[PDB]
Design a protein around this nucleic acid. Sequence first.
RNA 1: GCGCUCGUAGCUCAAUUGGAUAGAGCAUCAGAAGGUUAGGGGUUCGAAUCCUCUCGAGCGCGC
Length: 563
Amino acid sequence: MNIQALLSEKVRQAMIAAGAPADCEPQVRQSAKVQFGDYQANGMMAVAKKLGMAPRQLAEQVLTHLDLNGIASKVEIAGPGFINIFLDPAFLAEHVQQALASDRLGVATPEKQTIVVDYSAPNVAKEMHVGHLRSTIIGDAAVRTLEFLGHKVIRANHVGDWGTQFGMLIAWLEKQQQENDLEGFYRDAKKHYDEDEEFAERARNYVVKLQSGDEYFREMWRKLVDITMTQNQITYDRLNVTLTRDDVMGESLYNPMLPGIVADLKAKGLAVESEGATVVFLDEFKNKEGEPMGVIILYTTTDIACAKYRYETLHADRVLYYIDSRQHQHLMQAWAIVRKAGYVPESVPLEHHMFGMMLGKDGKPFKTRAGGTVKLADLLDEALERARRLVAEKNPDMPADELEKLANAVGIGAVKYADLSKNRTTDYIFDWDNMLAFEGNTAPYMQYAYTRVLSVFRKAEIDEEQLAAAPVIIREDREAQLAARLLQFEETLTVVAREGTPHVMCAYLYDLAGLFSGFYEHCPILSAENEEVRNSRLKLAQLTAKTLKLGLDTLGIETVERM
RNA sequence: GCGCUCGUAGCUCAAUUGGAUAGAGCAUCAGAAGGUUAGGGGUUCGAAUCCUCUCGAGCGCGC
């Protein structure tokens, strides 16, 4: 149920009937304060200028043809001409009911698109670092959200499985095999190819045979790759990320394309051998002219083939990119090249969602106390430990068999539900005291809140198959608030899918919880004057439980049934 | 030197993308307090949001 889009039309299909142009835009948002009802129409003022009249007069000129009967119970004008809509109880207590009768809670299925999500993107022959945790989590949240809506999501893991370093890598592997897993690999082999070593010409030659390709050096490649991706699939499985091995499309598939991509870029008149390198000129920035590359004898030419392959072979209607902030240039530049070359059209967006670096409670890069890179596994280990200590001092002397299970949900959930709360792209603070707490917008609070709600719909007799025969009658203004927000689940979902931002979902869920936690300490679902309301508020509570569950599911957050 | 992303309560984060009196959680003496949205100017009915400067933070291409 997308009430916004509903009122969006009935106001648009109005307005016109009060003198308005075709390209018309009502601005139907959710009211800030509760003074302004459940929804606002802001589109007046802006329109009330292109015709040069008066906003507070164009206002009720629309209400004359605006018939929100059976929908709203109170429509009034306020301020410089806002149209405030106070939803009618009987309208809410009809879609609150419709959501219950559906396994998708009334959420409608959009036009079945085909989207490609680019997330995680770890490196080869290196233990996965914590600087990739953000990309992996948010990307998976996007995928889950899109998948629930019904689209066809192609998970894309752009693994750095190619580069110069493989000469330094494979040679070490070839040598490290003469003694007998990856922990001091990339680190030790680096100590050779600089100071000090003699047969690095062995390594610098070992790479030039990989581009040519013969199974021997091809095995030493895949062998080195498959081990890294096996270590990482473990990390994913621990992290509850939906990624898989057959979701890997790294810097290998987008490599034999490099010739006939700049050649075709030259065979279309767009490249000049400036400075000594193939370059392609664009025009939308500074006081002279900037310039990307392609060759010289790069991290911009690969993405072009990438963004092309998504469209031409994978039939991507849309393609999301969850990548570090320090890559916005290299993408936008290399994407503007695809916009003025016609590889991928216009109906196919190339979205880029960004984020900064991991920092601690001190503005410095997130590192260990030794002063170095933090392994993601080592982070998850402490997450589970700190969670155990958390659950212990509140629920001690309890079956260990169901503590690790609960500590898993709390700890691993907190690690995820911490990027799913921030939307910035200018670095971020990692603080255990913020994420692992029963207070605030934290996963444990949501997880506890969900158990709380669920308990109410448990201690009562009223079985499952006759409860939904007694209807919902909303008579009080806290039930109306709750029921409204409950129905705004589709809106939030559509915003997440559109903007690629899961923080909205979490903000909603946090906001959704607070309503219940206020609807509870005032409106006794427990026991009231009659059965008519007892069952009604149960269903009203029953919905949020299903809603909180489904919401947390789209984020990839475990939900324990009991705390 | 050019260029990217930014600057919001003491801290960690919001603000439905230009809407009404900028909101939550810790912290500080259930409600309370906490703000010239780094700062000036400008654009219009209306700005944390957009345009131009200054300062400042982080990172990419530069000789």
